[PDB]
Amino acid sequence: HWGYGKHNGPEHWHKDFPIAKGERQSPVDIDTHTAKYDPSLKPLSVSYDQATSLRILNNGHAFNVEFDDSQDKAVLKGGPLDGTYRLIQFHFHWGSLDGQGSEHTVDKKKYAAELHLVHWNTKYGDFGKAVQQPDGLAVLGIFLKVGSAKPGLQKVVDVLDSIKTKGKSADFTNFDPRGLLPESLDYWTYPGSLTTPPLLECVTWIVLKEPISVSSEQVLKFRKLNFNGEGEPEELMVDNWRPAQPLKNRQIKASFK
Numbered sequence: 498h499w500g501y502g503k504h505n506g507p508e509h510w511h512k513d514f515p516i517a518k519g520e521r522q523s524p525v526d527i528d529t530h531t532a533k534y535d536p537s538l539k540p541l542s543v544s545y546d547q548a549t550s551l552r553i554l555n556n557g558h559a560f561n562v563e564f565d566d567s568q569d570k571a572v573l574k575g576g577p578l579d580g581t582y583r584l585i586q587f588h589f590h591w592g593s594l595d596g597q598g599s600e601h602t603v604d605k606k607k608y609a610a611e612l613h614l615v616h617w618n619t620k621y622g623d624f625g626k627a628v629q630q631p632d633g634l635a636v637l638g639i640f641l642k643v644g645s646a647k648p649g650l651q652k653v654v655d656v657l658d659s660i661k662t663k664g665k666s667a668d669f670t671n672f673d674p675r676g677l678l679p680e681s682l683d684y685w686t687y688p689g690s691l692t693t694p695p696l697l698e699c700v701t702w703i704v705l706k707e708p709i710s711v712s713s714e715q716v717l718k719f720r721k722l723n724f725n726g727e728g729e730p731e732e733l734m735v736d737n738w739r740p741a742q743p744l745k746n747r748q749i750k751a752s753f754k
């Protein structure tokens with residue numbers, strides 16, 4: 498099965514997922530000087546006040562915080578999007594060291610980690626149908642740098658001990674994802690893909706310019722998770738990021754001048 502090791506990592510994925518070499522793969526490097534300000538881009542509308550988190554799961558690749566997406570509660574609208582996208586889960590990618598971990602890069606800069614808030618287009622009815630469409634998903638990406646602690650992240654950090662290994666989950670209700678945002682909703686946007694297998698080309702990427710700060714202690718706890726299941730040899734869950742992919746025939750557009 499695919500993973501992030503030398504034997505099964507990003508260089509191998511194309512053998513079982515040939516779209517890995519497709520025309521709109523993610524992540525990409527964001528070249529800030531050539532991303533063009535688009536004054537027709539609308540402000541992002543993030544409506545998370547009614548979000549219903551349910552559970553946190555170590556899936557062997559990251560941890561996912563899952564939401565009740567059986568109704569229009571937490572939704573993303575506006576920005577580059579047409580119509581309404583429902584939040585289904587968030588997760589992170591991070592490094593073994595503070596100098597790497599993000600998937601997107603900014604003028605080749607790697608951040609310590611990257612948060613992905615995953616949403617699906619309600620006009621397709623379910624996430625499974627949305628991932629059969631080129632406009633099925635919208636992922637809001639937020640960079641993490643190491644500095645002061647992020648108070649809204651600490652509830653996540655403090656549950657990780659209970660989901661150390663692949664396949665473990667824990668009840669995780671009443672978590673407010675508004676506590677993970679930065680102040681500004683300035684963003685870059687481009688058409689891309691899932692960054693893990695199956696690498697499907699369904700995503701409108703919306704990457705916020707402003708990183709959130711997290712403390713060294715917070716990200717260190719991410720790095721104590723395990724890729725392996727219980728009873729198996731311990732493999733620290735670190736460096737679960739895909740490198741930047743060729744931009745090909747795409748443009749990145751900035752919401753801000």
Ligand SMILES: CCCCCOc1ccc(S(N)(=O)=O)cc1
Pocket residue numbers: 613615628636690691692693694695
């Ligand atoms: C039909 C596949 C469902 C399982 C995979 O779902 C994903 C995978 C990657 C991302 S990401 N890193 O691009 O945000 C978001 C959702």
Ligand code: NA
Pocket residue numbers: 531532533748749
């Ligand atoms: Na451009």
Ligand code: NA
Pocket residue numbers: 567568
């Ligand atoms: Na419901």
Ligand SMILES: [Zn+2]
Pocket residue numbers: 588589590613692
């Ligand atoms: Zn992701």
